[PDB]
Design an enzyme around this catalytic site. Sequence first.
Site, PDB file in Angstrom:
ATOM      1  CD  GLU A 135      -6.651   7.171   5.119  1.00  0.00           C
ATOM      2  OE1 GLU A 135      -7.546   6.317   5.040  1.00  0.00           O
ATOM      3  OE2 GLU A 135      -5.419   6.894   5.035  1.00  0.00           O
TER       4      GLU A 135
ATOM      5  CG  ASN B 285      -2.046   1.025   1.194  1.00  0.00           C
ATOM      6  OD1 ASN B 285      -2.559   1.406   2.253  1.00  0.00           O
ATOM      7  ND2 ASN B 285      -2.447   1.483  -0.019  1.00  0.00           N
TER       8      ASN B 285
ATOM      9  CD  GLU C 286      -4.906   4.194  -0.874  1.00  0.00           C
ATOM     10  OE1 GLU C 286      -5.427   5.279  -0.612  1.00  0.00           O
ATOM     11  OE2 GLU C 286      -4.999   3.208  -0.107  1.00  0.00           O
TER      12      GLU C 286
ATOM     13  CE1 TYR D 110      -3.398  10.622   2.590  1.00  0.00           C
ATOM     14  CE2 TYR D 110      -5.147   9.001   2.347  1.00  0.00           C
ATOM     15  CZ  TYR D 110      -3.991   9.442   2.981  1.00  0.00           C
ATOM     16  OH  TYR D 110      -3.427   8.675   3.991  1.00  0.00           O
TER      17      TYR D 110
ATOM     18  CE1 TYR E 107      -8.970   6.978   2.086  1.00  0.00           C
ATOM     19  CE2 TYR E 107      -7.897   7.223  -0.032  1.00  0.00           C
ATOM     20  CZ  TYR E 107      -7.929   6.686   1.233  1.00  0.00           C
ATOM     21  OH  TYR E 107      -6.882   5.845   1.599  1.00  0.00           O
TER      22      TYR E 107
HETATM   23  C1  LIG Z   1      -5.030   5.654   4.407  1.00  0.00           C
HETATM   24  O1  LIG Z   1      -3.897   5.724   3.483  1.00  0.00           O
HETATM   25  C2  LIG Z   1      -2.796   4.926   3.974  1.00  0.00           C
HETATM   26  C3  LIG Z   1      -2.435   5.205   5.415  1.00  0.00           C
HETATM   27  O2  LIG Z   1      -2.147   6.611   5.601  1.00  0.00           O
HETATM   28  C4  LIG Z   1      -0.795   6.897   5.936  1.00  0.00           C
HETATM   29  O3  LIG Z   1      -0.676   6.730   7.357  1.00  0.00           O
HETATM   30  C5  LIG Z   1       0.673   6.960   7.859  1.00  0.00           C
HETATM   31  C6  LIG Z   1       0.965   8.451   7.676  1.00  0.00           C
HETATM   32  O4  LIG Z   1       2.294   8.670   8.176  1.00  0.00           O
HETATM   33  C7  LIG Z   1       0.820   8.828   6.167  1.00  0.00           C
HETATM   34  O5  LIG Z   1       0.988  10.231   6.004  1.00  0.00           O
HETATM   35  C8  LIG Z   1      -0.552   8.376   5.599  1.00  0.00           C
HETATM   36  O6  LIG Z   1      -0.626   8.565   4.179  1.00  0.00           O
HETATM   37  C9  LIG Z   1      -3.619   4.825   6.305  1.00  0.00           C
HETATM   38  O7  LIG Z   1      -3.223   3.663   7.071  1.00  0.00           O
HETATM   39  C10 LIG Z   1      -4.860   4.527   5.451  1.00  0.00           C
HETATM   40  F1  LIG Z   1      -6.006   4.337   6.239  1.00  0.00           F
END
Ligand SMILES: *[C@H]1OC[C@@H](O[C@@H]2OC[C@@H](O)[C@H](O)[C@H]2O)[C@H](O)[C@H]1F
Length: 187
Positions: free
Chosen positions: A85, A44, A174, A76, A87
């Site tokens: 979070e 991811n 993503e 995002y 979207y």
């Molecule tokens: C949504 O996208 C992936 C992840 O988000 C990351 O979490 C860690 C942070 O440091 C980053 O800036 C984010 O992009 C999250 O687990 C998921 F739900």
Amino acid sequence: AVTSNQTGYHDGYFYSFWTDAPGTVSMELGPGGNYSTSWRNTGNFVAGKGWATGGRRTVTYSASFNPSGNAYLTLYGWTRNPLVEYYIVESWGTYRPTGTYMGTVTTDGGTYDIYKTTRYNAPSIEGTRTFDQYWSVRQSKRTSGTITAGNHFDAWARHGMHLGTHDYMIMATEGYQSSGSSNVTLG
Ligand SMILES: *[C@H]1OC[C@@H](O[C@@H]2OC[C@@H](O)[C@H](O)[C@H]2O)[C@H](O)[C@H]1F
């Protein structure tokens, strides 16, 4: 290339890059509002340019985004207190994201389905946490246009999806267990 987790500013734009699969994805920072990504058998990741502080801005973009597998082209970001979070999904690959359906919002020449989901013990801007995700998901795909983010935020709030204090906001690519490329330009 960016190939490891980080945020900063490049050419006037905030950017964030995150993956749980270091080595499977790279991000190039282009001029002004531009960036690109390339991934191969990734886990991811979320990467993009935008702003250190989100809010009710209008976001104008265009993109190369023709994925073969699971990926999103999406506004995002995050809030705190509550930690959320969010979207606003413009296009997607094999999987169109869905969740608990709340209704629709009509804005910027499209209609979007509103969904709510939750991630449990998951990476976040606040570390390993449980938190809701709020979605607007366009009813058909597009890869250029303007997003009036406030119209989404208000519609979510009208459906009882409460946002806290805004952290970052990026026009993000993503990918999930897929391979592909994107090239996104914020106008
Ligand atoms: C949504 O996208 C992936 C992840 O988000 C990351 O979490 C860690 C942070 O440091 C980053 O800036 C984010 O992009 C999250 O687990 C998921 F739900």
